[PDB]
Design a protein around this ligand. Structure first.
Ligand SMILES: Nc1ncnc2c1ncn2[C@@H]1O[C@H](COP(=O)(O)OP(=O)(O)O)[C@@H](O)[C@H]1O
Ligand SMILES: Nc1ncnc2c1ncn2[C@@H]1O[C@H](COP(=O)(O)OP(=O)(O)O)[C@@H](O)[C@H]1O
Length: 288
């Protein structure tokens, strides 16, 4: 609903045009030879080829960049926020979440829009830990900037760039004042109701790229705990996330009726934010 607000649509246009519609950065497709050498030594370490994974996806309506962190994902995680909030209020048995007003829900939703824009490849936090440990392992302890810190700083920069010209629109309607805006700009680099809310949106959407075992263990347990041990409420929440994924033609690997990409549908949603919203809106929200 706030995704249809003036602030909402403007943020969407901004993150899409300035970040999400662009290819990943070729300089971050792989490490160099010396870094590669250090990486392979750990047979437990997921392969450096993870740096190049989900680079782009071929689709009837065009080549889709960053298919695992593009506009479909971004809008879905934003979409989920208000529903997650409703479920937390009903089942958590935690007062913090009854402290969750619409405005705080709206801020969380808005901020989710900026949640993946800093990405320059599809590597995980773990891959980045490994890269740095191997840039080290390779060159006698020499430091290099954590790749995820760069992603965070980029996302932060994007956000500051957008809010600078939209303050009269965003304050006081969405952000109460400039210092509240400051806190959220800071939170983008680096445990509150808002954070847990946003983390759970991220968590639920990972069903798109985690297998069932990995998704159910790494992500569903944490949601189940968040909802007062109510497994059933968690499942309904997961069903809606599933349906949003299916509505956008995305792959779903970790929950429900799994599927590969619906290429036709995903190319359409991923290359037109407006089509993506329409499809997401087509899914009935679960009742609490
Ligand atoms: N530790 C992690 N495990 C799994 N997925 C992650 C992890 N960290 C980030 N992600 C994925 O990366 C996305 C955020 O990327 P991030 O590096 O924060 O980009 P940006 O800094 O531009 O927001 C999230 O949507 C999430 O799906
Ligand atoms: N688990 C929680 N649930 C809800 N609110 C929390 C939780 N933990 C801390 N908080 C409070 O929520 C606020 C989050 O920051 P923010 O929304 O920017 O505050 P403000 O709206 O006053 O600027 C913090 O002031 C903190 O006291």
């Amino acid at each position: 609903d706030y995704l249809l607000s003036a602030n909402g649509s403007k943020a969407i246009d901004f993150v899409w045009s300035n970040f999400l519609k662009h290819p990943y950065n070729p300089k971050l497709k792989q490490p160099d030879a010396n870094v590669k050498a250090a990486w392979e030594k750990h047979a437990d370490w997921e392969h450096w080829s993870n740096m190049g994974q989900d680079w782009s996806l071929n689709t009837p309506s065009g080549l889709v960049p960053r298919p695992n962190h593009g506009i479909a994902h971004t809008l879905r995680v934003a979409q989920l926020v208000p529903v997650i909030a409703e479920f937390l209020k009903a089942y958590s048995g935690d007062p913090k979440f009854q402290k969750l007003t619409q405005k705080e829900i709206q801020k969380a939703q808005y901020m989710m829009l900026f949640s993946v824009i800093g990405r320059e490849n599809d590597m995980s936090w773990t891959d980045a830990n490994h890269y740095q440990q191997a840039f080290k392992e390779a060159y006698n302890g020499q430091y290099s900037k954590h790749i995820y810190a760069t992603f965070k700083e980029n996302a932060q920069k994007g956000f500051l760039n957008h809010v600078v010209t939209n303050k009269s629109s965003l304050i006081p309607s969405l952000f109460s004042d400039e210092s509240e805006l400051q806190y959220w700009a800071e939170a983008l680099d680096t445990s509150s109701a808002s954070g847990i809310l946003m983390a759970l949106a991220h968590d639920l959407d990972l069903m798109r790229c985690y297998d069932k075992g990995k998704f159910n263990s790494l992500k569903m347990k944490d949601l189940v705990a968040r909802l007062g041990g109510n497994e059933d409420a968690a499942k309904k929440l997961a069903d809606y996330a599933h349906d949003l994924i299916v509505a956008t033609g995305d792959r779903c690997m970790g929950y429900g009726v799994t599927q590969d990409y619906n290429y036709s549908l995903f190319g359409k949603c991923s290359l037109d934010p407006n089509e993506c919203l329409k499809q997401l809106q087509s899914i009935p929200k679960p009742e609490t």
